[PDB]
Amino acid sequence: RKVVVSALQFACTDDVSTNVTTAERLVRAAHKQGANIVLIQELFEGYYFCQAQREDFIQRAKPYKDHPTIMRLQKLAKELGVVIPVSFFEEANNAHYNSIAIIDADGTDLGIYRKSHIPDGPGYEEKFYFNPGDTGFKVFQTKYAKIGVAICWDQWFPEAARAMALQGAEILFYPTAIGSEPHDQSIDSRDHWKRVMQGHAGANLVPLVASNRIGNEIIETEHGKSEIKFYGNSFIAGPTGEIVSIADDKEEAVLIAEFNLDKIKSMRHCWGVFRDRRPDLYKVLLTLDGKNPVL
Amino acid sequence: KGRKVVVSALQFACTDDVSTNVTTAERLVRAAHKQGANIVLIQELFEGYYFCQAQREDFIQRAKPYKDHPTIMRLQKLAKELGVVIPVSFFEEANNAHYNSIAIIDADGTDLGIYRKSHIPDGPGYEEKFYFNPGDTGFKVFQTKYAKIGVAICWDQWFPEAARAMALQGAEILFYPTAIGSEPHDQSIDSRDHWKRVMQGHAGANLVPLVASNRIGNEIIETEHGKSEIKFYGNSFIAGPTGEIVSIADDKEEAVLIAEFNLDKIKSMRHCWGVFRDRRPDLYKVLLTLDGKNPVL
Amino acid sequence: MAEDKGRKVVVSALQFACTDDVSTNVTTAERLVRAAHKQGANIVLIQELFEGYYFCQAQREDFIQRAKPYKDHPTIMRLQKLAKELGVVIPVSFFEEANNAHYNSIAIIDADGTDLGIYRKSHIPDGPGYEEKFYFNPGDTGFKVFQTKYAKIGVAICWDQWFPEAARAMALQGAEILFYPTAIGSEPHDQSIDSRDHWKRVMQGHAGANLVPLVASNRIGNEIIETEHGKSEIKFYGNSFIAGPTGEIVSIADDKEEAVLIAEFNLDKIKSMRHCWGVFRDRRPDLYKVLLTLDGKNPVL
Amino acid sequence: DKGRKVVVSALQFACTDDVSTNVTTAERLVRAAHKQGANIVLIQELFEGYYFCQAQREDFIQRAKPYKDHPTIMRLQKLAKELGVVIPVSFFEEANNAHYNSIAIIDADGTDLGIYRKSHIPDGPGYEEKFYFNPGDTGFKVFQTKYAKIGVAICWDQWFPEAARAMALQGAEILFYPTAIGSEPHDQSIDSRDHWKRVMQGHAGANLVPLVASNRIGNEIIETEHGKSEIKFYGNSFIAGPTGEIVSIADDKEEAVLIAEFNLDKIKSMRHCWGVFRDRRPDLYKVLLTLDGKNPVL
Amino acid sequence: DKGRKVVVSALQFACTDDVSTNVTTAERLVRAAHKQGANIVLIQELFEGYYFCQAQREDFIQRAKPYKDHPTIMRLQKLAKELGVVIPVSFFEEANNAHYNSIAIIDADGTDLGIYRKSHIPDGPGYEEKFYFNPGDTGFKVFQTKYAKIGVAICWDQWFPEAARAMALQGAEILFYPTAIGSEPHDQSIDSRDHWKRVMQGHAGANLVPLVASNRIGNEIIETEHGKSEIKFYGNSFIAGPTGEIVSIADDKEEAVLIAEFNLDKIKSMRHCWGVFRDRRPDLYKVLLTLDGKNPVL
Amino acid sequence: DKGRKVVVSALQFACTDDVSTNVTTAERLVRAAHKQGANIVLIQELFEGYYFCQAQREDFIQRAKPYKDHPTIMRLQKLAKELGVVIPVSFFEEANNAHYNSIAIIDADGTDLGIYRKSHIPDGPGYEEKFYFNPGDTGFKVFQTKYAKIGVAICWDQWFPEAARAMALQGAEILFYPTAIGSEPQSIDSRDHWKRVMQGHAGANLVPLVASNRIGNEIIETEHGKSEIKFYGNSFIAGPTGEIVSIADDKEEAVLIAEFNLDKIKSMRHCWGVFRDRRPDLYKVLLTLDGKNPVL
Ligand SMILES: *C(O)(O)NCCCCN
Ligand SMILES: *C(O)(O)NCCCCN
Ligand SMILES: *C(O)(O)NCCCCN
Ligand SMILES: *C(O)(O)NCCCCN
Ligand SMILES: *C(O)(O)NCCCCN
């Protein structure tokens, strides 16, 4: 059993219809190169608006139900027979989430995951927009594979990757929007970013796909212009954490890698780390401060 | 710029003759409509006297089924004629169950369904617990032609949980038909300021406007222990999304209160303030207890 | 002076002996229904499986084939004519065949002759003399109420009368009077068993707890059935009765006479009393999930 | 006649409005029961004072006390232990801002086995309990005592076949109901005593378990917010057997100590053979989780 | 060839009227099966005593015992753990006032994995089980053991294609049915043994899963409420492969230990290839939720 | 010996790839069954030609014909009326965009009582039938004939206990299964597996069961060249305990005959008690494919 996976990497305008056209073009290119599952970067419908903390930007969110972009990519998924996770800004009554809908290769909406770990600070004021997610970590049975899909900042947390692996994830996927930080040009996070994820692939023995944005974006914030340069470096890592495919920090790209899932599942079983785990000794992971279990 | 809705609170006196009272309600709904109202709110159990001063066998038989209710049917025609949303408070019989209920009539005349009062008051003057099963619909929101609304009934208005329950389900405006006044056993009790402050609190905590329609007049009821009298204190009002009173009636005048709200701007304001973003349902399990320790079954 | 307002309904319990010939027993039933109507009855209740002997003392292959379809049943059709002629409601107990299922059933015939539908016995008894579990699928209609020309009524069958759940289910759905056609007597394996006082008390409790009148019609006479292991005899103990909404017996027959019991109820006064007593206002269904278990712990599927 | 035997007792007495006097009365009659061989002794509802629920008064709510270190429960634990008798203790419970009509079950070694909180709360003239008590949130309970597994509910609960069935399904071998019922002050023509008995006899017969009801006697005048209100409590404390037969009964004015012995092994065998529990149809009982016969409650 | 192999066994013996004797007989035959390589061993229905259901007797109901701390289950857990063998244990369960014909599945490490309660209850002369057992309320279950996911149901359940299909759908790799079937005391012309085998062979073949049936032998006479009643149990315990072929079978009168090995990975692959499960039409099977071919049950 | 008696027959023959010839063969064998007293006679599946269904050829699709005015059905109606026999007629149905593997039930007076459309269609490696047939949408049916209430299902339907139970719950007194099964002239021989599953249905439902299978070798040229199947016959009739009462071999024409007392069998079915004892409250999992999620 072999599945072909793709990371896409492109620049966005602040127009939904242009960006969706761009995603469609790169999804067809992926499909043309053999892709069964194609990963589109985080909040690709527009500019990464979380540089600002603005009332009007919250109203960019849309219900999960009858979402125009999801609906449009469901047609594309269906035509091509590819699996397409769709990053979007969800409104759910008065709650708001950074969410992702998993469309199967028959175009079926398989359900959503809501971003669990919400980043904060200059350039990435996501805590202002999003309730911390309440779906918990999830795995989706698609026509090709059980996949673990989480979102951007979730990729820094070994807990997220481990939870998806424990629930049957054969591949992990992280749509991303990370770049420079507007308050401090000396912060270059790209190597650190890659290393943490490489760690998750190696610790769980599962391949991993990260799709990140490129281009410079200037946002009109409540305190004036703020600029981020997104550094791309979209990549696909194998089950021991080796980078098999990688983009640069400036050019549009379509990454492709094939994995033998039944072989990798045998290596995983045979390595035996899941049977060697000591959940009896991991209670402290349910604390924040190293002592008090959360309610 | 944005969806506007004009809401109205009515305030009037009742006899114990249904036809008279429905006629009074119609006159005032028409008057609200003439002043631009899209949703009009009539006070609790308006079809007669506030009979719950007594605990009487014969008064339980004032209840009628929800199905083919002559007062709901009559007000459905008016709703349709005028293009206004009309919540209709009534005493519901449902086989051997009885409830203090409200049917939400949409602006096309459609009966959108019912809510059954959840929190039932008790004590001299207000012996509701004798008459009504505690409601079993739970808190509801209704999609009307003009807005998603949350409607609850009188005593429900004291409970922050009801208001929050409706808001979490997308209610854009909260409505509470009311019957509250003096208390026949103790003339020193004057609850009007307390009553208003608690509702203002709900409007401000959920960032939604709130409408409260209360009775006026003195009513004398024969009870098992002789006459009992309540002076209903009016003070019907409409509050905006920070809990500010935008319109209020006094304690004796018949009144038609009118207010317009921009539901898109308020939505935007509600979200921006951030309370719904910041709620901690993981820490709210104690709210599912009565005694602060034991969760109910 | 005017008498007190409200819908009055006159109900009747019949009590008679059966042969094992269908034509004879239907003739007996018609005779007693007519006598009940002559005494003012609006609703008349015939005992369980009146078409024949209480054959359930045996577990026999050939007795299963006494069952007949509900559709075009000759006894139901005949009693429909009588109901229409007299203007009386008549529930008709019969052994139902429904493809390969079999039930102990009752068809409710309205005062205009209309077949309102059926109830299938839910609780099926077992044991020497009363081997009903061999014959009947447990019923699958659930507890029902029927709107007749005179009243909304709840009808269940024999062993159902021991279950408070059945009486409450019918009352919660607006039953104004409860009816139980019965066949109960001695038990052939042990002559010390005399259940008649126990039997009455349980049903009196239903009437009192739901504040609705209750009618029980039971068989009389001795019947001997040829069983797979020899002859078996039951003496049916009569004691048909009508109870009011506090569980008081307003009329009762003895253990051997043929009887036509008659009582009038003001259903509007009773409804008022039922509601004022307050039990239905005070019920706690949030605490009753355990009733959906058999063993006090595990909810059934 | 082999089998585990248990002797139960219903007590019936008049109350003053002084706790000390009523607790002394209860102790006297518990000792009289024990002298007659009783293993489990049932004291009537809210026996610490007058039946105060004729009134709806602010100050009466403050008669409530916490379950923890309750002076009357602690005193009766001493007696339970001294005599080797099981004693359910009815009390008015405060639990932060909630209030309940409650009963603590004291085992024959003095151990406090836990509480049941009254589920069905009556209302109306003379019996304004809904003003005082949150509807109970323990659900129906059974308690394993030294002598038997028992089901204890409280007064108005005794009208509900659901409560009796719920306790029996959980293995209750005997049902107990402390009571306060009498005349009704707004209508002198109401005499509920025969109705009250018939409904409980029904529960005993339907579940094939014995049942004990202890009820108050005497006239009580309460100063209500609208003037004097009077109830004459009608006694009629009784013990019913597993077919609903009254085996012992008190009249409507006498102080009484009723006594009956039950063979719990034989009764268990009878209950099972009669077959009602074998034949129940919980798949058809979902309408019991409605109030109106149609909508399941949340 | 390659893949997870499992050795299963059907045991067949005659019962005495003494519980401990009968458990010792079971232990002896379990040990003999283990010696021949068995991983999962099936003991016949209600093996602790005579098949008492010929009678409808009050005292026989009290032969039931709770699942909790059941002395026969506890004893067989020790054997399971000692030998590393999976052992389903048939017993007569008391659960407050409910009673069931039940089976506890003991894993090869001695762990009590839970119980299944007999769903379909037979009736008629000689087999009056409806008098004793509530219809089961666990539903059909599959248990994950150290060696396989197994589906265990009980005697009469074996006539119902629905039970076997329910277990296969939930992952059962082997079906097991402890049995007590023989002659019928009211009609000596009834010989059901060929019919009995054919129906089970049909389940194995329709689901492509092996099937194990363990039945009693011996003549048993029971004192019924109407005199002596005799059943001659007919043995014919057997093991069927995934196309329904009988691979091992006992006769109608001797003790037997039957043994068969199955390659569960090859059978699984063969079942997936055959594709019947992906070809099923559940959208057309709603009539199966009726008894009468028309009205769905509640 | 009292009660309604019905004589049923299973026919078995080799198909040529010529329609007239095959219908002539069917008529000859129906007449022979009638001569031996048969009241209801079962002809094997798709008997008008070679079993084309696993060859995936677009030109074979035009063999389908509408249910309305079907020349083979209309001809067998005449035969049914002439002889006073019930004849289920297997045919390849064209229904607008859809195509089905279907069977029309002809009563003893020649009346067309209706159609059943094969429900279970094998898809995945080895079985490419979807190329020709849509999954049936009639659901499982019973038909009241002059002699009996009967249930009929087709070929692959044979493997599914649900179809047999569904028919019996609705009052079918006899089950009929026209089939076509064989193998590559391979090691696996499915004939015993097949019989055991069917004997299971008869025994579990306490109804007799009639199965008609073809014989002979058939060669079809396909996209992937010549495919050959040897059909293994073994048509049979089973009684209500699953006992085989007559059976054909794997190479000759056969006319199998058996008489059933439908009143006695009904009484036996009811007394055995399985239908009294069924637990539909516990069967919801059967409305899933994966053992957890109900289908729409
Ligand atoms: C996505 O937007 O969560 N990446 C967050 C990066 C935060 C860097 N300080
Ligand atoms: C409406 O009737 O619920 N108002 C109740 C007020 C109670 C005052 N103590
Ligand atoms: C009717 O037939 O159900 N009465 C059942 C009585 C059973 C007595 N043990
Ligand atoms: C106890 O106190 O609940 N008694 C209730 C009686 C109410 C009479 N209508
Ligand atoms: C086990 O006891 O279920 N076998 C029942 C057989 C009944 C025979 N008619």
Numbering used by the authors:
A (entry chain G): 7 to 301
B (entry chain E): 5 to 301
C (entry chain C): 1 to 301
D (entry chain D), E (entry chain B): 4 to 301
F (entry chain A): 4 to 188, 191 to 301
What does the literature reporting this entry say, word for word?
The structures of wild-type MtCPA, crystallized in the presence of PUT and CAD in the solution, were determined at 1.97 and 2.19 Å resolution, respectively. Inspection of the electron density maps, representing the structure of MtCPA cocrystallized with PUT, brought unexpected, but very informative results. Instead of linear PUT, the reaction intermediate, DHMP, was observed in the active site. More interestingly, DHMP was covalently bound to the catalytic Cys158. The DHMP covalent adduct is stabilized by placement of one of its oxygen atoms within the oxyanion hole, created by Nζ of Lys121 and the backbone N of Trp159 (see Active Site and the Reaction Mechanism). DHMP adduct was most probably formed as the result of the reaction of the amine group of PUT with carbon dioxide, absorbed by the crystallization drop, followed by nucleophilic attack of the active Cys158. This showed that the oxyanion hole, next to the MtCPA catalytic triad, is able to stabilize the otherwise labile geminal diol. Subsequently, the amino group of the intermediate accepts a proton, donated by Glu48, and leaves as the first by-product, ammonia, resulting in the planar S-acyl intermediate-enzyme complex, which is hydrated to yield the tetrahedral oxyanionic geminal diol (present in the crystal structure of MtCPA/DHMP complex). All bound amines, CAD, PUT and DHMP, present the same hydrogen bond between terminal amine group and the side chain oxygen of Glu187.
The arginine route involves three enzymatic steps: (i) arginine decarboxylation to agmatine by arginine decarboxylase (ADC, EC 4.1.1.19); (ii) deimination of agmatine by agmatine iminohydrolase (AIH, EC 3.5.3.12) and (iii) hydrolysis of N-carbamoylputrescine (NCP) to putrescine by N-carbamoylputrescine amidohydrolase (CPA, EC 3.5.1.53), with the release of carbon dioxide and ammonia. N-carbamoylputrescine amidohydrolase enzymes belong to nitrilases, and more precisely, to C-N hydrolases breaking non-peptide bonds using Cys-Glu-Lys catalytic triad. The octameric MtCPA enzyme is assembled into an incomplete helical twist, made by four tight dimers with swapped C-termini. As in other nitrilases, the substrate hydrolysis is carried out by the catalytic triad, composed in MtCPA of Glu48 (proton acceptor), Lys121 (proton donor) and Cys158 (nucleophile).
